[PDB]
Motif scaffolding. Structure first.
Motif, PDB file in Angstrom:
ATOM      1  N   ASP C 291      16.893  14.939  38.648  1.00 13.36           N
ATOM      2  CA  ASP C 291      17.373  14.373  37.399  1.00 13.36           C
ATOM      3  C   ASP C 291      16.514  14.839  36.275  1.00 13.36           C
ATOM      4  N   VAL C 292      15.719  15.909  36.617  1.00 15.55           N
ATOM      5  CA  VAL C 292      14.666  16.482  35.726  1.00 15.55           C
ATOM      6  C   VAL C 292      15.279  17.732  35.118  1.00 15.55           C
ATOM      7  N   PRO C 364      -4.517  23.863  40.930  1.00 16.18           N
ATOM      8  CA  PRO C 364      -4.871  22.411  40.868  1.00 16.18           C
ATOM      9  C   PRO C 364      -4.892  21.877  39.444  1.00 16.18           C
ATOM     10  N   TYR C 365      -4.024  20.869  39.145  1.00 12.85           N
ATOM     11  CA  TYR C 365      -3.981  20.478  37.726  1.00 12.85           C
ATOM     12  C   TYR C 365      -2.795  19.579  37.798  1.00 12.85           C
ATOM     13  N   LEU C 366      -3.032  18.266  38.004  1.00 15.50           N
ATOM     14  CA  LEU C 366      -2.139  17.229  38.373  1.00 15.50           C
ATOM     15  C   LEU C 366      -0.840  17.119  37.474  1.00 15.50           C
ATOM     16  N   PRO C 367      -0.616  17.239  36.138  1.00 15.99           N
ATOM     17  CA  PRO C 367       0.662  17.084  35.553  1.00 15.99           C
ATOM     18  C   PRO C 367       1.706  18.117  35.845  1.00 15.99           C
ATOM     19  N   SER C 368       1.344  19.086  36.752  1.00 17.22           N
ATOM     20  CA  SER C 368       2.249  20.137  37.084  1.00 17.22           C
ATOM     21  C   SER C 368       1.723  20.827  38.315  1.00 17.22           C
ATOM     22  N   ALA C 369       1.423  19.994  39.327  1.00 19.77           N
ATOM     23  CA  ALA C 369       0.862  20.414  40.572  1.00 19.77           C
ATOM     24  C   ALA C 369       0.726  19.123  41.331  1.00 19.77           C
ATOM     25  N   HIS C 370       1.496  18.088  40.992  1.00 18.25           N
ATOM     26  CA  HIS C 370       1.511  16.766  41.653  1.00 18.25           C
ATOM     27  C   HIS C 370       2.685  16.036  41.033  1.00 18.25           C
ATOM     28  N   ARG C 371       3.298  16.598  39.998  1.00 25.13           N
ATOM     29  CA  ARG C 371       4.451  15.928  39.367  1.00 25.13           C
ATOM     30  C   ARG C 371       5.303  17.124  39.181  1.00 25.13           C
ATOM     31  N   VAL C 372       6.664  16.883  39.244  1.00 28.32           N
ATOM     32  CA  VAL C 372       7.698  17.844  38.946  1.00 28.32           C
ATOM     33  C   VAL C 372       7.530  18.262  37.490  1.00 28.32           C
ATOM     34  N   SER C 373       7.610  19.606  37.243  1.00 26.76           N
ATOM     35  CA  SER C 373       7.481  20.110  35.884  1.00 26.76           C
ATOM     36  C   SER C 373       8.842  21.001  35.730  1.00 26.76           C
ATOM     37  N   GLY C 374       9.474  20.796  34.530  1.00 24.89           N
ATOM     38  CA  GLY C 374      10.703  21.439  34.095  1.00 24.89           C
ATOM     39  C   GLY C 374      10.425  22.152  32.753  1.00 24.89           C
ATOM     40  N   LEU C 375      10.483  23.489  32.611  1.00 23.85           N
ATOM     41  CA  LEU C 375      10.439  24.227  31.406  1.00 23.85           C
ATOM     42  C   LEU C 375      11.777  24.781  31.204  1.00 23.85           C
ATOM     43  N   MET C 376      12.335  24.649  29.966  1.00 23.48           N
ATOM     44  CA  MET C 376      13.623  25.244  29.621  1.00 23.48           C
ATOM     45  C   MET C 376      13.313  26.279  28.657  1.00 23.48           C
ATOM     46  N   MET C 377      13.903  27.523  28.784  1.00 20.14           N
ATOM     47  CA  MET C 377      13.727  28.534  27.811  1.00 20.14           C
ATOM     48  C   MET C 377      15.224  28.866  27.671  1.00 20.14           C
TER      49      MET C 377
ATOM     50  N   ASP D  55      17.298   7.634  33.945  1.00 19.18           N
ATOM     51  CA  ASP D  55      17.008   8.997  34.322  1.00 19.18           C
ATOM     52  C   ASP D  55      15.511   9.140  34.047  1.00 19.18           C
ATOM     53  N   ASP D  56      14.874   7.983  33.862  1.00 15.03           N
ATOM     54  CA  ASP D  56      13.450   7.936  33.671  1.00 15.03           C
ATOM     55  C   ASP D  56      13.027   6.447  33.910  1.00 15.03           C
ATOM     56  N   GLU D  57      13.800   5.753  34.740  1.00 16.79           N
ATOM     57  CA  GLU D  57      13.757   4.384  34.972  1.00 16.79           C
ATOM     58  C   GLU D  57      13.733   3.392  33.781  1.00 16.79           C
ATOM     59  N   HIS D  58      14.634   3.568  32.846  1.00 18.85           N
ATOM     60  CA  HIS D  58      14.850   2.690  31.759  1.00 18.85           C
ATOM     61  C   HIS D  58      16.269   2.301  31.807  1.00 18.85           C
ATOM     62  N   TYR D  59      16.543   1.066  31.317  1.00 17.95           N
ATOM     63  CA  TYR D  59      17.830   0.406  31.351  1.00 17.95           C
ATOM     64  C   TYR D  59      18.050   0.027  29.920  1.00 17.95           C
ATOM     65  N   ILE D  60      19.281   0.253  29.407  1.00 16.34           N
ATOM     66  CA  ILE D  60      19.470  -0.081  28.044  1.00 16.34           C
ATOM     67  C   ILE D  60      20.705  -0.953  28.045  1.00 16.34           C
ATOM     68  N   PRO D  61      20.742  -2.170  27.443  1.00 18.08           N
ATOM     69  CA  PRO D  61      22.015  -2.806  27.222  1.00 18.08           C
ATOM     70  C   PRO D  61      23.036  -1.891  26.581  1.00 18.08           C
ATOM     71  N   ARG D  62      24.331  -1.943  27.060  1.00 17.37           N
ATOM     72  CA  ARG D  62      25.380  -1.246  26.345  1.00 17.37           C
ATOM     73  C   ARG D  62      25.963  -2.364  25.502  1.00 17.37           C
ATOM     74  N   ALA D  63      25.371  -2.622  24.298  1.00 13.90           N
ATOM     75  CA  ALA D  63      25.708  -3.711  23.392  1.00 13.90           C
ATOM     76  C   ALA D  63      25.900  -3.085  22.079  1.00 13.90           C
ATOM     77  N   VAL D  64      26.825  -3.586  21.263  1.00 13.04           N
ATOM     78  CA  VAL D  64      26.945  -3.225  19.826  1.00 13.04           C
ATOM     79  C   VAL D  64      27.020  -4.526  19.150  1.00 13.04           C
ATOM     80  N   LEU D  65      26.330  -4.682  17.924  1.00 17.45           N
ATOM     81  CA  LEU D  65      26.237  -5.879  17.185  1.00 17.45           C
ATOM     82  C   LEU D  65      26.444  -5.468  15.759  1.00 17.45           C
ATOM     83  N   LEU D  66      27.603  -5.818  15.266  1.00 16.99           N
ATOM     84  CA  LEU D  66      28.072  -5.641  13.893  1.00 16.99           C
ATOM     85  C   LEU D  66      28.332  -7.077  13.530  1.00 16.99           C
ATOM     86  N   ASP D  67      27.910  -7.428  12.288  1.00 23.87           N
ATOM     87  CA  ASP D  67      28.277  -8.749  11.756  1.00 23.87           C
ATOM     88  C   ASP D  67      27.940  -8.802  10.278  1.00 23.87           C
TER      89      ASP D  67
END
Lengths: 72, 81, 436, 436
Positions: C291-292, C364-377, D55-67
């Motif tokens: 999902d990265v 060795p360098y934990l934010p990208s050698a212990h966690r999934v790293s995604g670069l988009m070009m 997709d990063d373990e966050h949950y967001i209410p699907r709420a809209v508040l107009l008044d």
């Protein structure tokens, strides 16, 4: 589509994406089983079944006879 | 070597990698150095890729070599336009 | 035999390479002149490629740092990295000239320092096995870094007509005009060199930096002073196929070649995912790679000012997805299998587009050698939204009256302003023409 | 992947959905950041069903508040769960408003804020795998929910015809005439869209709300703060076949298909047993499950005012009795044995009726896995009393000469008042005809 040998591949990837956007409750269980749909009625419905493995010696309780009694 | 490509050493996937090589010489020799001869070189490439698509579709069985799955990514690309 | 000379130039250009060289000693986990770990030779299997190997117990950067204010490189002297750089080989410690802020100051100072400016990058290569190219790490911000660096985008592709040009252009804050007010001028002149005196470019927008710094790194206080921190991280990410081996596209000209359809399109949107802090309280149980890449085919990391209805009215044409280091490399192809079923990918509505995945290790360098790293070009056709931002802030300045005469105080004494305008609308339109 | 967007609209419509989102976080055991309870995935097998798909373990209410009233929504952004809420796809932080308190205020503001009101449900339907529908959590109190709520009753019937419509119509105490007096006018314009441009409503009256607030929570002097717990519980309560798998009528358009005889009769009365703290003493050893629907066989907990003597001049047609959590279900087939024998709910005499029984799993949170629950979703034809009650308050208001020219200075300038009268009498005849 009445059952044919190419409808088999279609139902496999179809169970694949379907159960995957729902999120199947265990991610590594998804590619160790799938549904399998060979004579044709006129519809694939009520003509599809399950394919799933079994391990040592759990199979004497889950012998290949009684998996048919559940599938029918 | 099953995982590499394999091609059962006989099958037109082996004929398309041979044939797209034969246009690749026409691409380097024209660009190093004819504009109608350029566009013919890739019209033959477009013949060879559209030949490849019909081959993927007759290889599709239900699961048959790990290249097949990755090829159906590109098939659905072809469907998207 | 792929030695690259970085040409760090400008007020910011010296800072983004100041923190680039500093990133390499800390990710290899060694002293910048010693060895205090064995991860240096085991992690990095080509220790010299932007350095040279030891013969004096010190590391040797392949760097030049020229600017029109001597203040920025003395702010490299002040810092204790004088045993990673040399203040008589690697920089001129006090190099003056202009005030400066004019683009036309430095463009005329490269042509009276013409003899000296190619005997310092060609004296920087002198034990090299063979040259790959030049990376012009220069600044568009100010007229100093932009002024002399735009002359070298031309002379390095015909005195060496077979070597690589590719620029790290960094813009000045577009939420100011009180930092530099010659900003619409100095931008567009360089953008003429970006389409026909180049090859490929990297354009980095500054307001999208501060959009991410408060939403993925969550600092409260959005300022123009996070410009160099997010940039130095993507710079060291881009060359994990040259400082650690590749397999296919095992050169840097491999990645960069396949992201250029035509001249005038090669403006690559850069994305780099490991900035999230909610992926780090879940790194004990190993975060997932499924999902990265729904962050590289959906906005969540763009440093390019692009619209929200321009990720649908334009599609990816070429998209490269560079996975790095520990990543679980046996399901990255399973992750790319489920992309087509949702349709998170975007393809042109005519012919071929291509989702390239490739992989490469790291030290060795934990934010990208212990966690999934995604670069988009990435390579998106939605790049005209910025070229409309720079054109609309440029003609807006001419109804305010400024730099129609205050630009012609040195060098420029002939009209060529509607000549930079005309070539720019030719650029923005042929891109839209190139697709259905 | 069965995502519902709640549409809170009106002054009372914002207070009832505030504690609805607050019930969900407390039962899923989650933090407003991440996961702190593994009952979050084992208890709720479909966390995302009103929330953003993580997709990063966050949950967001699907709420809209107009008044048009900023007083009610400023108590939502000064909450601990104001970080569960984000003012960037929901609402503004310090949002504005119309006059308001007129039906013509909010109906005309509906169509010049027409871009953002249909571009804030499609900024909450971009990870969506298919939208279930929209739930219009709109008030019948004042002109605010009713003006702005009459607009979205129309456009979701034709920009979104496939999608499910269902509303929480909440009345205020109808005997007000000095803080609101325009209540029979604003009510009937909304009541006309509710029966012809909507399929289902969930009716709720206030005089039976305070009926519970003094005999189940027990105040000596009424408050309207013991009225918002009663609505927010029944909101999470309807979705226990959908937030956690069912089997049959596992869709929400499944429950409703068997609860609607045909539009012209669709107004569901709601009933809820565990509102009182004397139902946790009937689950220390489990009290029998025979009696939990023989208290819904003739209601005594309804949030809809009605007589008990208007149950013998009317006949139930469809009644749903959803039981929740641990109830030890094995004497539940015994409970349907005893229903026909009392007949306190008359069944229709032109043909058979339906006694629907359900069970549902829920998380191990204490009031969802201990207390015996009966949730009623009735559909009884004695509802014609409420329609006779709002129409008696209209016709009395027109002979005082009020709103004959006072409501037709804004967006009314043509007759439509007897259209509201006639459409109420066709609805009233067709409810009673379905037991004739």
């Amino acid at each position: 589509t009445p059952p044919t040998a190419v409808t088999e591949h279609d139902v496999n990837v179809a169970f694949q994406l379907s159960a995957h956007k729902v999120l199947l409750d265990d991610d590594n269980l998804l590619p160790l089983l799938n549904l399998t749909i060979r004579e044709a009625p006129t519809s694939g419905w009520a003509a599809l079944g399950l394919s799933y493995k079994v391990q040592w010696p759990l199979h004497i309780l889950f012998t290949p006879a009684v998996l048919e009694k559940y599938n029918v | 070597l099953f995982r590499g490509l394999l091609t059962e050493k006989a099958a037109p996937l082996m004929n398309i990698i041979h044939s797209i090589f034969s246009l690749i010489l026409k691409f380097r020799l024209q660009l190093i150095s004819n504009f109608g001869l350029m566009q013919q070189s890739y019209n033959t490439f477009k013949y060879y890729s559209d030949f490849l698509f019909e081959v993927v579709s007759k290889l599709v069985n239900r699961g048959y070599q790990p290249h097949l799955e990755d090829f159906l990514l590109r098939i659905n690309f072809n469907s998207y336009y | 035999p792929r030695e690259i000379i970085t040409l760090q130039l400008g007020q910011c250009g010296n800072q983004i390479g100041f923190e680039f060289w500093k990133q390499l000693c800390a990710e290899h986990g060694i002293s910048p002149e010693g060895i205090v770990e064995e991860f240096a030779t085991e992690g990095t299997d080509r220790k010299d490629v932007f350095f040279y190997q030891a013969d004096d117990e010190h590391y040797i950067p392949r760097a030049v740092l020229l600017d029109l204010e001597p203040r920025v490189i003395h702010s490299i002297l002040n810092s204790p990295y004088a045993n990673l750089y040399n203040p008589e080989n690697i920089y001129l410690s006090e190099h003056g000239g202009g005030a400066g802020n004019n683009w036309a100051s430095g463009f005329s100072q490269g042509e009276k320092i013409h003899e000296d400016i190619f005997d310092i990058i060609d004296r920087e290569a002198d034990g090299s096995d063979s040259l790959e190219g030049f990376v012009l790490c220069h600044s568009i911000a100010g007229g100093t870094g932009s002024g002399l660096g735009s002359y070298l985008l031309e002379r390095l592709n015909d005195r060496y007509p077979k070597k690589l040009v590719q620029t790290y252009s960094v813009f000045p804050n577009q939420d100011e005009m009180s930092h530099v007010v010659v900003q619409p001028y100095n931008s567009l002149l360089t953008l003429k060199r970006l389409t026909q005196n180049a090859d490929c470019v990297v354009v980095l927008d500054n307001t999208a930096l501060n959009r991410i710094a408060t939403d993925r790194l969550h600092i409260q206080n959005p300022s123009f002073s996070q410009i160099n921190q997010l940039v130095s991280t993507i710079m060291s990410a881009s060359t994990t196929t040259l400082r650690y081996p590749g397999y296919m596209n095992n050169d840097l000209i491999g990645l960069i070649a396949s992201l250029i359809p035509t001249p005038r399109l090669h403006f690559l949107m850069t994305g780099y995912t490991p900035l999230t802090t909610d992926q780090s309280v879940a790194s004990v149980r190993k975060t997932t790679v499924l999902d990265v890449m729904r962050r590289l085919l959906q906005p969540k990391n763009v440093m390019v000012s692009t619209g929200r209805d321009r990720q649908t009215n334009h599609c990816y044409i070429a998209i490269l997805n560079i996975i790095q280091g520990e990543v679980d490399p046996t399901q990255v192809h399973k992750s790319l299998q489920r992309i087509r079923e949702r349709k998170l990918a975007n393809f042109i509505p005519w012919g071929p587009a291509s989702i390239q995945v490739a992989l490469s290790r790291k030290s060795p360098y934990l934010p990208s050698a212990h966690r999934v790293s995604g670069l988009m070009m990435a390579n998106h056709t939605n790049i005209s939204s910025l070229f409309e931002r720079t054109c609309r802030q440029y003609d807006k300045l001419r109804k305010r009256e400024a730099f129609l005469e205050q630009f012609r105080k040195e060098d420029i004494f002939k009209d060529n302003f509607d000549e930079l305008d005309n070539s720019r609308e030719i650029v923005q339109q042929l891109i839209d023409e190139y697709h259905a």
